[PDB]
Amino acid sequence: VSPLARSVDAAIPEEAFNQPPTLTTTLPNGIRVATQRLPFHQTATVGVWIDSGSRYDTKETNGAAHFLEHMTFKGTKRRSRIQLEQEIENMGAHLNAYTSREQTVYYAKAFKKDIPQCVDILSDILLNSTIDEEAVQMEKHVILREMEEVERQTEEVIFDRLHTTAFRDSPLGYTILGPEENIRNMTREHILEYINRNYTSDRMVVAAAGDVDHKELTALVEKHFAGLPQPKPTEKPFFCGSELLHRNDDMGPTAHVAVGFEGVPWKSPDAVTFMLMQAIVGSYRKHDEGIVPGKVSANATVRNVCNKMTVGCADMFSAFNTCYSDTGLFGFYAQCDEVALEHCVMEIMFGITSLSYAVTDEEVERAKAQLKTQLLGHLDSTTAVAEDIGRQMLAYGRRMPLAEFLKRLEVIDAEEVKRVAWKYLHDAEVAVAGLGPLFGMPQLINLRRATFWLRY
Amino acid sequence: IRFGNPWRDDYPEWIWKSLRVSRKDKDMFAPFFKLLNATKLYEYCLKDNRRYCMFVMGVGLVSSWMWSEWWNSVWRRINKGKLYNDVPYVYP
Ligand SMILES: CCCCCCCCCCCCCCCCCC(=O)OC[C@H](COP(=O)([O-])OCC(O)COP(=O)([O-])OC[C@@H](COC(=O)CCCCCCCCCCCCCCCCC)OC(=O)CCCCCCCCCCCCCCCCC)OC(=O)CCCCCCCCCCCCCCCCC
Ligand SMILES: [Zn+2]
């Protein structure tokens, strides 16, 4: 009757369904090609995504994966280093690469007419690089300086040490750079052994996005990657509950901390719920805040942190969720004052423990809104789309279209969150890492007994 | 004499050796823990503190009484023919 009950209702807009298709094809040797064409763009992105990283080093040569990333730009059988660099630059293009624990990525940006050349170049440097010993013995300088700098970026060292203390028994523990003595001892044969054990056709996919045609890309891949060799049980990584604390009173008043829980794999049904829980806890910065004061925010965790002792007890905090092929991590990172550390940490643990007892649908819907804004807001440019194509191709064997993600996200309510949390996070093991003025720091047993409430 | 002597005290070599022995990555009671974990007592009765309290109270209630009656029976078994019931009085 009343007009206030006549409002338009569209949970999922029509645009979520009216999206261009993602085209897929597998070549005889096992290489997979994926594409999506976007009419509203002039350029394109094309690259290679490889299912290998530092998790596939051996403990004796830990650090070879990352060394190969440098070696591939040093020269090939067809072109010298000067020739290679000038043929990067004279296109007026971009070329990027990086490696991680489980994945390695190379890609370029160009106008359509130069996609062939790009493919060629990519193939070359992936298949035909000359790993000269008298160049390996020089890249050690640059890699050692790179490590030197990396030790100064505190967030990354904290996360590395969290992985170190959480996965003691597994190659997930390994850092990407590798120890110092390994950087000094690295040898051509180690790098070539890594190549000839991991660069097989089943592990590579080629993706593009922008102004691209699937047929020509498939033909180009068939033309250039004909030389890639073809291929010829494992068990779940164990998660250890331990702490690793570096006490230091000569680096100023601020303490850094990270806490972690055991997660779920990429393909797990509950993965989406985990993506949502990360958003329900969210983040905060005291320096830069948007337009909502923390003391009145809709997020209860931020609100509780900002009202502590009337002054508020944190400089920054942010939650995170990371999924791997067979396991995950779930947790948070924080920065706070020496004397605030205790509250700084226990407030957020109370946060995360609430997910299993008392969360309500106002909060769930706020978190859905913010999560959708974030994720759907990134996928604008060709690079983001190509990265998403390749990432999903490796993680799932497919690409999941937007409508599917939205439909699966819609039907999660509070009781479902309160079920999954009760399944994985209530009364669990946790791993801890920290740096700085840690006199305040809580005990490991405190953090572990925090995961349940005696009330209720 | 090395024992209790500040001029000479040190461990015997066999005590120094007992500390070198190792049982890493071995466990001999795993079958018992597997059995207990299979009963799923934790999932249903001990993972939630309200149920933890219910369990404590009820198991108390029943166990106390069983223990009591068992000790009663023992007290009658050891003292047979000494207690009042076992030897009736016969009137003159
Ligand atoms: C002679 C007289 C002597 C009297 C002595 C009494 C001693 C009792 C001490 C009370 C317990 C400590 C309280 C401190 C709480 C700190 C504040 C806080 O933040 O707590 C959060 C915490 C809530 O947890 P959370 O915030 O969700 O997160 C917890 C963490 O995750 C994880 O937790 P955590 O690791 O942070 O640890 C928390 C810890 C905090 O504590 C500590 O860290 C230190 C350790 C605590 C002290 C331990 C020693 C106490 C000894 C207990 C035995 C006393 C018996 C006395 C009998 C007298 C006989 C003459 O709290 C506990 O775990 C306490 C548990 C024990 C209290 C519950 C007992 C009630 C049972 C009632 C059963 C029904 C009986 C009816 C029959 C009548 C019986 C008389 O609060 C609690 O649960 C604390 C207890 C709350 C009280 C509940 C109601 C009590 C009333 C009982 C019924 C009265 C019966 C009378 C009727 C008589 C009929 C004739
Ligand atoms: Zn580097």
Q: In the 8-state DSSP scheme, what is residue A112?
A: G
Determine the residue type at B58: G
Query: Where do the DSSP E strands lie in A221-301?
Result: 243-247, 254-262, 283-285
Residue A189 sits at the vertex; the CA angle it makes with A188 and A195, to the nearest 5 degrees, is 95
Give the number of other CB atoms < 10 A from CB of residue A199: 17
Contacts of A456 in chain B (CB under 8 A): 48-50
Please give the Cα distance from A95 to A121 (Å, whole number). 10
Please give the Cα distance from A31 to A38 (Å, whole number). 24
Q: Is residue A445 in contact with ligand 1, taking CB distance under 6 Å?
A: no
Cβ-count burial B54-74 (b if 16+ within 10 Å, e if not): eeeeeeeeeeeeeeeeeeeee
Q: Which residue has the tokens 């190549």?
A: A195
Closest C-alpha among A332, A294, A341 to residue A314: A341
Please give the Cα distance from B83 to A122 (Å, whole number). 100
Query: Per 3-state DSSP, what percentage of chain A is helix, strand, and coil (rounded to 5)?
Result: 45, 20, 35
Please give the Cα distance from A447 to A258 (Å, whole number). 12
Q: List helix spans (H) across A152-257.
A: 154-166, 180-185, 188-198, 214-224
SS3 call for A358? coil
Closest C-alpha among B45, B68, B73, B69 to residue B58: B45
Distances (CA, A) of A339 to A313, A332, A336, B27, B87: 9, 20, 8, 43, 77
Q: In the 8-state DSSP scheme, what is residue A53?
A: -
Determine the residue type at A8: V
Question: Hey, are the CB atoms on A456 and B48 less than 8 Å from each other?
Answer: yes
Question: Hey, are the CB atoms on A427 and B47 less than 8 Å from each other?
Answer: yes
- DSSP per residue, A396-411: HSS---HHHHHHHHHT
Please give the Cα distance from A210 to A386 (Å, whole number). 8
The token pair at A285 is: 């910065």
Task: List residues of B whose CB lies inside 8 A of any A CB.
Answer: 47-50
Q: Which residue has the tokens 């890249």?
A: A139
How many helices and strands (H and E) does chain A possess? 16, 12
Please give the Cα distance from A398 to A207 (Å, whole number). 12
Q: Which residue has the tokens 């299979």?
A: B38
Protein residue whose Cα sits closest to atom 34 of ligand 1: A449
- Rg of chain A taking only CA atoms, in angstroms: 24
Q: Is residue A446 in contact with ligand 1, taking CB distance under 6 Å?
A: no
Burial of residue A234 (CB within 10 Å: 0-12, 13-18, 19+) is: exposed
Residue A109 sits at the vertex; the CA angle it makes with A106 and A112, to the nearest 5 degrees, is 125
Distances (CA, A) of A230 to A14, A31, A33, A194, A204: 43, 10, 16, 15, 11
**Residues 6+ positions from A374 with CB-CB distance below 8 Å:** A279
Burial of residue A185 (CB within 10 Å: 0-12, 13-18, 19+) is: middle
Residue A173 sits at the vertex; the CA angle it makes with A172 and A178, to the nearest 5 degrees, is 105
Pairing of strands A32-36, A204-210: parallel
**Which atom of ligand 1 approaches the CA of A453 most closely?**
27
Rounded to 5 degrees, φ, ψ at A111 are: -70, 160
SS3 call for A208? strand
Q: List helix spans (H) across A42-187.
A: 64-71, 81-89, 115-127, 133-150, 154-166, 180-185
Which ligand approaches the C-alpha of residue A427 most closely? 1
Please give the Cα distance from A11 to A412 (Å, whole number). 13
* N residues, chain A: 456
Residue A64 sits at the vertex; the CA angle it makes with A60 and A69, to the nearest 5 degrees, is 170
Contacts of B48 in chain A (CB under 8 A): 456
The CA distance from B48 to the nearest CA of chain A, in Å, is: 7
Rounded to 5 degrees, φ, ψ at A218 are: -60, -45
Closest C-alpha among A390, A237, A408, A386 to residue A325: A237
The CA distance from A442 to the nearest CA of chain B, in Å, is: 24
A 417-436 → B contacts, CB under 8 A: 426-427
Residue A100 sits at the vertex; the CA angle it makes with A423 and A94, to the nearest 5 degrees, is 130
Burial of residue A240 (CB within 10 Å: 0-12, 13-18, 19+) is: middle
Closest C-alpha among A133, A128, A119 to residue A77: A128
The token pair at B18 is: 């007992």
Q: Do residues A206 and A47 touch, judged by C-beta distance below 8 A?
A: yes
* First-to-last C-alpha distance (Å) of chain A: 43
Angle between helices A64-71 and A133-150 (to 10 degrees): 110
Give the number of other CB atoms < 10 A from CB of residue A213: 15
Q: Do residues A346 and A263 touch, judged by C-beta distance below 8 A?
A: no
Q: In the 8-state DSSP scheme, what is residue A17?
A: T
The H-or-E segment that residue A329 falls in is strand A328-337
Cα dihedral A409/A414/A416/A420 (nearest 10): 100
Partner residues linked to A43 by β-bridges:
A111
Q: Is residue A449 in contact with ligand 1, taking CB distance under 6 Å?
A: yes
Q: Do residues A93 and A121 touch, judged by C-beta distance below 8 A?
A: no
Angle between helices A361-378 and A402-410 (to 10 degrees): 170
Please give the Cα distance from A93 to A80 (Å, whole number). 19
Which ligand approaches the C-alpha of residue A449 most closely? 1
Please give the Cα distance from A259 to A254 (Å, whole number). 17
Question: Hey, are the CB atoms on B47 and A426 less than 8 Å from each other?
Answer: yes
The H-or-E segment that residue A317 falls in is strand A316-323
Burial of residue A8 (CB within 10 Å: 0-12, 13-18, 19+) is: exposed
- DSSP per residue, A267-283: T-TTHHHHHHHHHHH-E
Q: Do residues A82 and A425 touch, judged by C-beta distance below 8 A?
A: no
Q: Do residues A228 and A44 touch, judged by C-beta distance below 8 A?
A: no
Please give the Cα distance from A178 to B62 (Å, whole number). 60
Q: Do residues A121 and A47 touch, judged by C-beta distance below 8 A?
A: no
Please give the Cα distance from A349 to A448 (Å, whole number). 10
The answer to whether A168 faces chain B, any CB pair under 8 Å, is no
Q: Which residue has the tokens 């068939």?
A: A222
SS3 call for A261? strand
Residue A403 sits at the vertex; the CA angle it makes with A400 and A409, to the nearest 5 degrees, is 90
Give the number of other CB atoms < 10 A from CB of residue A48: 23
Method: cryo-EM
β-sheet with A431-436: strand ranges across = A243-247, A431-436, A254-262, A328-337, A316-323, A283-285
